[PDB]
């Protein structure tokens, strides 16, 4: 099994990019990371920048998830990012994606110690 951590990482983390700069990063990032096996995910956010920036949002803004819970964090700075969605053409094992690349501020949760992110909940 994969560890919150590492699965956040995995579904997450694109710091080998500043952005997307293509149509089609998406449909190769979502497979690429694994995210298409017997199923297409519908949503997922990829950041551009590096893990110990993402990791450091864990001490900055604290907010309310989305849940209610209150082990979210909000980014101080904007990062750039690209949001993967599904398009009406997506039909698996035939994945489509929209790339929309952009520049807001990320929410994660975060657990454990070390008190690292382990979701993802949303951007403003």
């Given at each position: 099994?994969?560890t919150?951590?590492?699965?956040?990482?995995?579904?997450?983390?694109?710091?080998?990019?500043?952005?997307?700069?293509?149509?089609?990063?998406?449909?190769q990032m979502?497979?690429?990371?694994?995210?298409?096996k017997?199923?297409?995910?519908?949503?997922?956010?990829f950041?551009?920048?590096?893990?110990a920036?993402?990791?450091?949002?864990?001490?900055?803004k604290?907010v309310?998830?989305?849940?209610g819970?209150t082990?979210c964090?909000?980014?101080?700075?904007?990062?750039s990012?690209?949001?993967?969605?599904?398009?009406?053409?997506?039909?698996?094992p035939?994945?489509?994606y929209?790339?929309?690349q952009?520049?807001?501020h990320?929410?994660?949760?975060?657990?454990?110690?070390?008190?690292?992110?382990?979701?993802?909940?949303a951007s403003?």
């Amino acid at each position: 099994k994969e560890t919150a951590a590492a699965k956040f990482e995995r579904q997450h983390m694109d710091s080998s990019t500043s952005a997307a700069s293509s149509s089609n990063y998406c449909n190769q990032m979502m497979k690429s990371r694994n995210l298409t096996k017997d199923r297409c995910k519908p949503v997922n956010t990829f950041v551009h920048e590096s893990l110990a920036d993402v990791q450091a949002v864990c001490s900055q803004k604290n907010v309310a998830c989305k849940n209610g819970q209150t082990n979210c964090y909000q980014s101080y700075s904007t990062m750039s990012i690209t949001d993967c969605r599904e398009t009406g053409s997506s039909k698996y094992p035939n994945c489509a994606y929209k790339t929309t690349q952009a520049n807001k501020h990320i929410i994660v949760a975060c657990e454990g110690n070390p008190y690292v992110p382990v979701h993802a909940d949303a951007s403003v």
